[PDB]
Design a protein around this ligand. Structure first.
Ligand SMILES: COc1cc(OCc2cccc(-c3ccccc3)c2C)cc(OC)c1CN[C@H](C)C(=O)O
Lengths: 125, 126
């Protein structure tokens, strides 16, 4: 069966750093880009959509603009890796990577964000 | 674009009855089952998986045992309908219909559960 796997289903990262959350699917041969679909979301807001070799960002949620990229470089390795830069406190939650490449499956990844008092306090108001 | 559509994205049902929540996907002429993949989840609790023309119950969440069917007949019509029987108070929430058939898409459906005092009282006391 075609199954998406997640090497680590929980990440805890420090406010303001960068994170790469990985999502693995089988790639036996050379990648067939036109058969590939990658959807990354967080809660119910789109982070990246990838169909026919191109990222589509019309969908992408405000709070992910210019901070979220899919390392297409790893896709040929079978790795839909999402890179978030300048991790905010509002990035903590459940992410889902959904992959269709001759079959389909999806997996959740939970992200916790440690933060110093100051950043938490400004998130508070 | 491959688009899953939901004719009704809100359902109101009475406790202990059955509900059928509707989810439609494009099929022009006769269906290719080896390409069809349907997942019904509810707030990240797996309800149904349908792969290779077979429902997969290996991931089915405890609370949906033998209460959930996918109407296998109407799949050729472009109809992924999830059928829940003996609707519980914990069946209220956001459902998600995920469909891969060449393209891929998913849609949410909210379900509210009306229940009389006694049933709500046992649910409250759980
Ligand atoms: C949230 O909506 C989505 C979701 C998309 O992947 C959703 C997606 C992507 C990959 C695999 C599985 C899947 C996983 C397990 C079981 C069944 C399917 C799923 C649901 C792609 C989209 O775009 C291609 C759009 C956008 N709508 C527009 C109308 C469109 O499809 O053009």
């Amino acid at each position: 069966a075609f199954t998406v796997t997640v090497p680590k289903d929980l990440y805890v990262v420090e406010y303001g750093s960068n994170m790469t959350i990985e999502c693995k699917f089988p790639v036996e041969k050379q990648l067939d880009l036109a058969a590939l679909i990658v959807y990354w979301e967080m809660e119910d807001k789109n982070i990246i959509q990838f169909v026919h070799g191109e990222e589509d960002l019309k969908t992408q949620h405000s709070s992910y603009r210019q901070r979220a990229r899919l390392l297409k470089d790893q896709l040929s390795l079978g790795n839909a890796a999402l890179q978030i830069t300048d991790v905010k406190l509002q990035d903590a939650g459940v992410y889902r990577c959904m992959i269709s490449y001759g079959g389909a499956d999806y997996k959740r990844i939970t992200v916790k964000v440690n933060a110093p008092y100051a950043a938490a306090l400004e998130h508070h108001h």
